[PDB]
Amino acid sequence: SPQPLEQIKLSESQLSGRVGMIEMDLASGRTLTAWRADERFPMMSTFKVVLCGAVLARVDAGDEQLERKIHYRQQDLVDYSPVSEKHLADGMTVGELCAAAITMSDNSAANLLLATVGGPAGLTAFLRQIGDNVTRLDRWETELNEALPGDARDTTTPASMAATLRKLLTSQRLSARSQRQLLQWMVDDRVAGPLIRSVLPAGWFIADKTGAGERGARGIVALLGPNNKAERIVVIYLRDTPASMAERNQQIAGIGAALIEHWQR
Ligand SMILES: OC[C@H]1O[C@H](O[C@H]2[C@H](O)[C@@H](O)[C@H](OCCCCCCC3CCCCC3)O[C@@H]2CO)[C@H](O)[C@@H](O)[C@@H]1O
Ligand SMILES: C[C@H]1CC(C)(C)OB(CNC(=O)/C(=N\OC(C)(C)C(=O)O)c2csc(N)n2)O1
Ligand SMILES: CC(C)(O/N=C(\C(=O)NCB(O)O)c1csc(N)n1)C(=O)O
């Protein structure tokens, strides 16, 4: 495969869209490589990881419990709720909701959790508290996927998203158990995880959350490394391309392949 930036250029040329990318050491925050890493992209469903970071923060503070059962109504549901639509009778625990939000991309699960942290405004306040002055959530599922050009709503940058994920996973802002839990949920992704793992070379650790939006928007936040270690955070976003979903997936895959083949020490 081409060198990562070579591949990214080919991708933008072929898609007529923008790509944003960063690869960053999990432990130290050392940036290995980056492209448009300070440009804004819609987070889409990638925000679900940050959301559950916020939820875990509330658990650590004694404001919430992963065990707490939330009961909700059919009228609370939005588009794409494969897990949550199954539990109108019995409800779901906060932890179960995070699991459904991260591992199945369940939108109503996400909205229910979003309510517990003070809505988009509350999640944005949480981001500011952990020193992310860039990322912002403004809407709920599914409006937050609108991806209007020039709209700052519901956006991050690759560099801010990677820094924030690192903060959530390793900085001891969250408790030891909470850090472990957030990791677990990403390891357990059911949307793309098993497929990615199936096509990764042997020895490569994967944990991830994907996202998709309008106008071609597509993305992934991932923990990746050789030697079965979560060595690095990789963020790849795509925006403003008329291309097929198949082509968007393949391009992100080819950028991933480039990063893997050309992994530096
Ligand atoms: O020489 C290095 C490697 O090159 C290839 O491996 C390929 C593999 O055959 C392909 O299937 C994968 O696709 C990448 C997997 C796509 C998954 C999506 C990408 C995600 C991953 C997490 C962050 C970025 C986005 O690329 C690697 C690297 O070229 C060879 O098949 C393999 O034997 C060899 O060890
Ligand atoms: C993820 C972050 C999001 C956010 C919103 C930054 O705050 B925290 C933690 N703090 C609170 O949730 C909180 N009240 O919690 C209870 C109700 C327990 C209380 O102490 O009264 C609160 C925040 S602003 C306001 N007026 N009240 O979670
Ligand atoms: C699984 C996938 C593509 O997300 N799929 C969604 C969806 O609504 N995602 C919202 B997120 O990108 O804010 C969806 C709606 S109807 C349908 N089918 N899928 C993702 O998160 O990657």
Curated annotation (Swiss-Prot):
GO term, biological process aspect, one: beta-lactam antibiotic catabolic process
Disulfide bond recorded as keyword: yes
Inducing or repressing factors: Increased expression in clinical isolate strain 15571, in concert with reduced expression of a 45-kDa outer membrane protein, confers increased resistance to ceftazidime.
Disulfide bridge map: 52-98
Activity regulation behaviour: Inhibited by the beta-lactamase-blocking agents clavulanic acid, sulbactam, avibactam or tazobactam, or SA1-204 or LN1-255 via a covalent binding to Ser-45. Inhibitors SA1-204 and LN1-255 may be approximately 16-fold more effective than tazobactam. May also be inhibited by tazobactam via a covalent binding to Ser-105.
Domain of life assignment: Bacteria
PROSITE patterns, sorted: BETA_LACTAMASE_A
Substitution effect: residue 154 to N: Reduces resistance to piperacillin about 16-fold in DH10B E.coli strain. Decreases resistance to combined piperacillin and tazobactam about 1000-fold in DH10B E.coli strain
Assigned keywords, A-Z: Antibiotic resistance, Disulfide bond, Hydrolase, Plasmid, Signal
Effect of residue 80 to E: Reduces catalytic efficiency toward ampicillin
Active site positions, chain numbering: 45, 143
Effect of residue 249 to V/Q/E/C/T/H: Reduces resistance to penicillins about 8-fold and to cephalothin about 8-fold in DH10B E.coli strain. Decreases resistance to combined ampicillin and clavulanic acid about 2-fold in DH10B E.coli strain
TM segment ranges: none
GO MF term set: beta-lactamase activity
Effect of residue 249 to G/S: Reduces resistance to penicillins about 4-fold and to cephalothin about 8-fold in DH10B E.coli strain. No effect on resistance to combined ampicillin and clavulanic acid in DH10B E.coli strain
Binding residues annotated for a beta-lactam, in chain numbering: 48, 105, 141
EC number: 3.5.2.6
Protein purpose: Broad-spectrum beta-lactamase which confers resistance to penicillins, as well as first- and third-generation cephalosporins. Has nitrocefin-hydrolyzing activity. Inactive against the cephalosporins, cefotaxime and cefoxitin, and the carbapenem, meropenem.
NCBIfam families registered for this protein in UniProt: bla_class_A (NF033103), SHV (NF000285), SHV_LEN_OKP (NF012143)
Summary of subunit composition and partner proteins: Interacts with S.clavuligerus beta-lactamase inhibitor protein BLIP.
Name of this chain's protein: Beta-lactamase SHV-1
